[PDB]
């Protein structure tokens, strides 16, 4: 269900925040990779968050094959071209569908939708004040 938006977001995050080779070759010891940072940045725009476990999983299982170019995916264009091409479709369609659905929900169900003593008469108004004491 994950879309190109998240893929490109996390790819660029790993590329440009950790300043690390795409193959995760640690050039210098101090700069180990951090996947919770990438998880946060990618969740910053995803419709639903996903654990850093899933972020690294997506990286390893898709992006690494996707980026290499020698994969047997008919020489893929890599996520950069797809992200550049699909500015509209996903962004517009997901949100428009959500808006239409919740408009229908707003329409749904319905557009929201004697006695011990009585009748002294008004002489009682003043006299009663004191008379009732006993």
């Amino acid at each position: 269900e994950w879309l190109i938006s998240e893929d490109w977001a996390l790819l660029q995050a790993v590329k440009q925040l950790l300043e690390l080779p795409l193959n995760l070759t640690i050039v210098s010891p101090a700069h180990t990779p951090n996947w919770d940072l990438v998880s946060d940045v990618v969740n910053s725009c995803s419709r639903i968050y996903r654990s850093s476990k899933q972020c690294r999983n997506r990286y390893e299982n898709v992006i690494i094959p996707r980026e290499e170019g020698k994969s047997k995916n008919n020489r893929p264009l890599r996520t950069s071209q797809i992200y550049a091409q699909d500015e509209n479709a996903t962004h517009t369609q997901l949100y428009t569908s959500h808006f239409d659905l919740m408009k229908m929900t707003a329409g749904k169900r319905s557009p929201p939708i004697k006695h011990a003593s009585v009748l002294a008469e008004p002489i009682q108004v003043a006299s009663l004040r004191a008379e009732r004491i006993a």
Partner: protein, 1314 residues
């Protein structure tokens, strides 16, 4: 190597030998034991640490840049866990310093001079000389290596020393490096921060990364940092407020402003990019605000960047309630966006503005009790959201979706939200779809609590809204466990058992009282009440067959839950949802009659609070076909009477009240509404014999209710009093029917009681003051002292019936409590010793004169430079020399003033200025310290044995609580302090509870002036309570923070105080003394340049006024003084942020009070800010009323003070977020027709205007004039409380306040530049 430590850490020797071996090996790849080597560098035993560091220090070069690189790229700090490696960082860095140099410092100012130095400034002795030489030599050869070697040890043992040393050292090291290499290091710092090697330090409160970021923040060339990584750091390493401050600084310096987006994005061409830079910094900062629950700051940010107009209106609605409107505004926003997207591009820029509408539509929808709709949406046909279903489905009857909706949530593992899922498991465990044994719930609740505490440990140090969720959860966690116990009591073995029957009663009684507060959103209240309702529904099922009342107990519990939930719904204004919730009660077949009565009462209140008059009639008259319970028959009679009153019905409402009082007489609200109706009649066509009815009704109402919900009726009484004629029949009714109304109520109305007593025929009223004084001596004494002495002063300077009455009370209550009165007089008479020396006596009057004459100079601004001193100011100048006219001052002042006070105004002002300067400079030599023991006796000997006396001012506000604190001992010391217009002395009291309570003894002239300030303070004090009855006001913690002042004597009075409190002018004074000028230069430039422009035959013009403001702000009054002071005085980020937010919150109320109530203008010195807490209190506002007439108008250029030097400290977002929201919320609160805010003004202002009438010349004229004056308040309130297309006028006038076209033409004394 890695097995020896983890399961055998308790050793101290075996580890020692093992680490010795590890240390040896590194002297001879096998160099792969770095974890053990690093653990060795953090060993406790000093010798092992030194041995490790010895080799560690030879694995480098003897340079600073190399070692700074090593700690950032060539070393991995993940090896050590909760350690704080900055200690080793400091060691390594300092290791390169020289060691053979003799010690030295640059602090020549703190050096101790040599003995022979005195020459340069221009035989036992011999043995002493040589004995000194042989000590001086051995102290001469010491070398800094000693200090450096020892400093690091203290760093080791103490974390705080280490972190502060790092913060103070890293910036200094940065300057050592040349730019050629500073940039190289800075390039790789950012990689260092993001590295996952620091993940282990997440839960360490003083994280070694927190210290590092804090330290780098000070590097003199600002080190760059990605705007997105900062959000993550704030999230994890507890850098919340520092991260937000850094992002704000970048936003207001990099973008120079918000991406204000004046027009549509298709034409807003200045967008930085399709995913604009300088816009990620906006979104990350907005997300930080949203996390911190700083909803007002967040809204202030979104109302300044949004593209669509509709979103701004929805935010404004939602931020103040009206959820039904916010939902529809969001819906229309989405519709409008959709109709464009259907034929338009995505424009990724407005991603966040898109998801915002979805999130807030969810938020509004749930708080409206649309739970079923939310569940259906969450389980959408596609694009499903599971968390929403998990949150909502259990409130509704469904018990399957959440069962399903957990499995995918658990794998998602949203850490920092983990306690919620563990807690939620319990809900199914109890209300299982089929059943559960519920024995393991204890582990669930304990794990949830532990994880919640763990999360708490990572929030900022000072509690704020950010902590609200956890404190809110605690209750529902413990209620989960409580319901688990009851259900365990419902097992068939225990079901129906008396032991369980006891437990269920105990738990239901406990629940029926432990409730949230009105500041908790209706969603949270729904959570609690539905969770309870589930189990309440459980009991009737088993007891549904013995005349078992257990089923009746469950019925009562459920009905009460429903009714209370609907009641709170109504309290928040959502009458419709309240109507639905209450109407749900019909589904129950059997309900106690009292519950039906409560149901109809709530429904009829709903009808009243929105009209549906005929429904209100039917809902009442449809009941009691044969018999409802007897008591509430009055209740529906009173409700019908007030309905008939809302509509034009007159006499049937009177019959309704007569019936309502017919049986039991104790229904307070019936009396209240009958009195309201009678008063409405009596305001016109007096028919005064009818009038007694209103007073009788209000007094009856206050007889039963006590200590609160009564003050309004007392105000009505004291207002109706003024209508009484010579045949004072209203006084007769008061005497005949005020019997038994407790004296505790009257305390709030002491000053009004006295001022009415001093009037004609007050003798009849004197009974009540006698009654109160008999019961509350200390309360009425000091006011009586002051008033009696005021009459004595006036009638003497110009034995009388008012003084006769005052004495008749004082010497009457002397019979009682002689000891207490004697002690009070002893204190007061002793206090006279606090009089000031001649210097202060002169300076107070000089300050008063300077203010008085600058007022005129502004009044003559734009006119002759040769303006002349007014007769009043000249009379004051004459009095100066008369009272004072030591040799040099006595000589000089008497020729520089008095009659010479005539002639050119602007030369007298300069002479006054230099005289002020010289005298104030001479005051420096005065002692700053003196004791009680000397020059005064009786105070020192004071102790609780003599007599019990409350802390001065405890009686300023009645309270049913005892709450009273006695004096225990006056401290042996009192301090002389500077102040705005005096140098009043300070003394420290110690209460019986052991706390200190500093106090200021201030002496002032012009008593009639001074007695209005406490009147306005009384009004503020009496208004504060209403701020606690509304959600919108409680949410933001709004209060007026009036200090405590008591009128000891007409000439002087006591006032509470706290050290560290200072006024803006004081900060200006500090930063001005920091430079080679004095504080009066701004006004000097203003007036001199205006005069020079004038001298060319040119009248004052708007443009030159703006020019002078701009230039004086540019050169001598830069706008950053306030922010820079706040920066250097709060170098800790959390303190800075909380101080700033409290500052803004208080300033909002200050401005609102100044405007709505037509108060005096707020000068700089008039405002006092508490450095310790950031609270604000004013230097005694007073109603602004014209001398010529009491029309009560205040039409100054700017409605309230918002000087630029304040605005820049608050920044643009603050001035448009919290301030506007707070002002609108307050205005909405007071506008309530429920609160009789009428009387609380129609009494205070009736008192006030008499002060004007007395200073310049007592019938229905006064009534009419106060009636007029109050309508000014009413108009200036209503005309900023209503909601419309322009959501509030506040938008207009807050913009007016900061506009240059309204500040530059303000009185320069008012310091519009500061």
């Amino acid at each position: 190597m890695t097995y020896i430590e983890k399961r055998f850490p308790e050793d101290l020797e075996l580890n020692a030998q093992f680490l010795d071996l590890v240390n040896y090996v590194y002297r001879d790849l096998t160099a792969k034991l770095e974890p053990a080597f690093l653990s060795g560098l953090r060993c406790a035993q000093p010798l092992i640490r030194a041995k490790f560091f010895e080799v560690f220090d030879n694995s480098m070069k003897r340079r600073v840049y190399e070692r700074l690189l090593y700690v950032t790229c060539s070393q991995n700090w993940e090896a050590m866990g909760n350690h704080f490696w900055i200690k080793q960082c400091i060691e390594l860095l300092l290791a390169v310093c020289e060691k053979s140099t003799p010690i030295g410092t640059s602090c020549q100012g703190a050096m101790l001079p040599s003995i022979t130095n005195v020459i340069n400034l221009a035989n036992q002795l011999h043995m002493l000389t040589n004995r000194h030489d042989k000590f001086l030599d051995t102290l001469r050869e010491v070398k800094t290596g000693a200090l450096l070697s020892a400093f690091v040890q203290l760093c080791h043992i103490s974390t705080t020393l280490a972190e502060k040393t790092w913060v103070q050292l890293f910036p200094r090291l940065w300057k050592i490096l040349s730019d050629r290499q500073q940039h190289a290091l800075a390039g790789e710092i950012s990689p260092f921060l993001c590295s996952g090697s620091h993940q282990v330090q997440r839960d360490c409160q003083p994280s070694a990364l927190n210290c590092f970021v804090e330290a780098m923040s000070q590097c003199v060339p600002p080190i760059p940092i990605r705007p997105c990584v900062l959000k993550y750091l704030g999230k994890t390493h507890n850098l919340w407020f520092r991260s937000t401050l850094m992002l704000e600084h970048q936003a207001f310096e990099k973008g120079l402003s918000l991406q204000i987006k004046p027009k549509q994005t298709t034409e807003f061409y200045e967008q930085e990019s399709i995913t604009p830079p300088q816009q990620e910094i906006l979104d990350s900062l907005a997300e930080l605000y949203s996390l911190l629950q700083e909803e007002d700051m967040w809204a202030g940010l979104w109302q300044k960047r949004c593209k669509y107009s509709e979103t701004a209106t929805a935010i404004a609605y939602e931020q103040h309630g009206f959820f039904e409107q916010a939902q529809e505004s969001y819906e229309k926003a989405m519709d409008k966006a959709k109709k464009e997207h259907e034929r338009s591009n995505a424009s990724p820029a407005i991603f966040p503005e898109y998801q915002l509408w979805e999130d807030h539509w969810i938020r509004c929808s749930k708080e409206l009790n649309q739970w079923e709709a939310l569940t259906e949406y969450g389980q959408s046909k596609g694009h499903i959201n599971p968390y929403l279903v998990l949150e909502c489905a259990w409130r509704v009857s469904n018990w399957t979706a959440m069962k399903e909706a957990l499995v995918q949530v658990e794998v998602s593992c949203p850490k920092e939200m983990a306690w919620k899922v563990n807690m939620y498991r319990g809900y199914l465990a109890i209300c299982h779809p089929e059943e559960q044994q519920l024995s393991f719930i204890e582990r669930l609740v304990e794990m949830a609590s532990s994880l919640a505490i763990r999360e708490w440990r990572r929030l900022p140090h000072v509690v704020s809204h950010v902590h609200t969720p956890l404190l809110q959860a605690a209750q529902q966690i413990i209620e989960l466990q409580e319901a688990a116990q009851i259900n365990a009591g419902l097992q068939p073995t225990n079901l129906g058992r008396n032991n369980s029957l006891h437990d269920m009663k105990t738990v239901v009684k406990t629940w029926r009282n432990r409730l949230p507060i009105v500041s908790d959103d209706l969603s949270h209240w729904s959570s609690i009440f539905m969770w309870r309702q589930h189990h309440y529904q459980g009991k009737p099922t088993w007891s549904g067959m013995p005349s078992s009342n257990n089923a009746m107990l469950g019925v009562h519990a459920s009905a009460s839950a429903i009714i209370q939930y609907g009641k709170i719904a109504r309290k928040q204004g959502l009458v419709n949802v309240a109507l639905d919730i209450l109407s749900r009660i019909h589904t129950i077949p059997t309900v106690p009659i009292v519950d039906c009565f409560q149901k109809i009462r709530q429904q009829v209140k709903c009808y009243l609070q929105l009209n549906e008059c005929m429904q209100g009639l039917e809902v009442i008259e449809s009941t009691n076909l044969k018999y409802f319970t007897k008591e509430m028959t009055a209740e529906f009679y009173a409700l019908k009477g007030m309905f008939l009153a809302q509509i034009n019905k007159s006499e049937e409402a009177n019959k309704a009240f007569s019936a309502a009082v017919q049986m039991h007489d104790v229904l307070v609200k019936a009396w209240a509404m009958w009195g309201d109706y009678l008063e409405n009649i009596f305001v016109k066509e007096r028919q005064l014999h009818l009038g007694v009815s209103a007073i009788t009704c209000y007094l009856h109402a206050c007889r039963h209710q006590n200590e609160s919900k009564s003050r309004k009726y007392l105000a009505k009484v004291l207002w109706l009093l003024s209508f009484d004629d010579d045949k004072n029949t209203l006084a007769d009714a008061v005497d005949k029917y005020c019997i038994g109304v407790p004296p505790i109520q009257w305390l709030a109305w002491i000053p009004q009681l006295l001022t009415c007593l001093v009037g004609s025929e007050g003798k009849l009223l004197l009974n009540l003051i006698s009654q109160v004084g008999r019961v509350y001596p200390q309360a009425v004494y000091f006011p009586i002292r002051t008033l009696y002495l005021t009459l004595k002063i006036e009638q003497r300077e110009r034995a009388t019936a008012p003084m006769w009455r005052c004495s008749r009370i004082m010497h009457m209550q002397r019979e009682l409590h002689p000891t207490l009165l004697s002690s009070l007089e002893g204190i007061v008479d002793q206090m006279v010793w606090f009089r000031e020396n001649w210097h202060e006596e002169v300076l107070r009057q000089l300050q008063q004169g300077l203010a008085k004459c600058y007022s005129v100079a502004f009044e003559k601004s734009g006119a002759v430079s040769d303006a002349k001193i007014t007769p009043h100011t000249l009379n004051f100048v004459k009095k100066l020399v008369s009272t004072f006219g030591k040799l040099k001052g006595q000589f000089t002042t008497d020729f520089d003033f008095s009659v010479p006070g005539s002639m050119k105004l602007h030369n007298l002002i300069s002479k006054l200025k230099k005289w002020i300067k010289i005298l104030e400079a001479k005051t420096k030599q005065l002692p700053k310290f003196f004791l009680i023991e000397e020059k005064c006796r009786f105070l020192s000997n004071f102790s609780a044995q003599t007599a019990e006396v409350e802390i001065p001012g405890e009686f300023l506000m009645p309270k049913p609580t005892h709450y009273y604190i006695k004096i225990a001992r006056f401290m042996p010391r009192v301090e002389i302090v500077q102040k705005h217009n005096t140098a009043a002395r300070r003394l420290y009291i110690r209460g019986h509870n052991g706390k200190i309570y500093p106090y200021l003894v201030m002496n002032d002239a012009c008593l009639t002036e001074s007695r209005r300030e406490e009147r306005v303070l009384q009004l503020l004090r009496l208004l504060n309570p209403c701020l606690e009855k509304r959600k919108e006001t409680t949410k933001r913690h709004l209060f007026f923070t009036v200090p405590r002042v008591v009128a000891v004597s007409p000439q002087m009075r006591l006032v509470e105080d706290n050290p560290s409190s200072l006024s803006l002018v004081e900060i200006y004074k500090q930063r001005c003394a920091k430079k080679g000028i004095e504080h009066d230069n701004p006004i000097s430039r203003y007036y001199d340049r205006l005069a020079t422009v004038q001298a060319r035959g040119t009248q004052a013009s708007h443009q030159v006024l703006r020019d002078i403001l701009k230039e004086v702000q540019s050169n001598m009054v830069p706008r950053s003084m306030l922010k820079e002071w706040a920066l250097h005085t709060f170098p800790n980020a959390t303190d800075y942020w909380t101080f700033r937010k409290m500052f803004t919150i208080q300033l909002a109320l200050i401005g609102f009070a100044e405007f709505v109530l037509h108060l005096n203008r707020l000068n700089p010195e008039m405002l006092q800010i508490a450095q310790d807490t950031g609270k604000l209190n004013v230097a005694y506002f007073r109603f602004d009323i014209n001398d010529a007439t009491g029309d009560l108008d205040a039409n100054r250029p700017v409605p309230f003070r918002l000087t630029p030097n304040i605005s820049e400290f608050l920044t643009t977002i603050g001035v448009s977020g919290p301030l506007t929201a707070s002002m609108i919320a307050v205005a909405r609160c007071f506008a309530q027709p429920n609160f009789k805010v009428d009387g609380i003004l129609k009494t205070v202002l009736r008192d006030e205007i008499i002060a004007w009438h007395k200073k310049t010349q007592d019938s229905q004229q006064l009534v009419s004039l106060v009636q007029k004056a109050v309508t000014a308040i009413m108009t200036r309130l209503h005309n900023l409380a209503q909601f419309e297309g322009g959501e509030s006028k506040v938008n207009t006038l807050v913009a007016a306040a900061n506009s240059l076209d309204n500040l530059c033409r303000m009185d320069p004394a008012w310091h519009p530049w500061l």
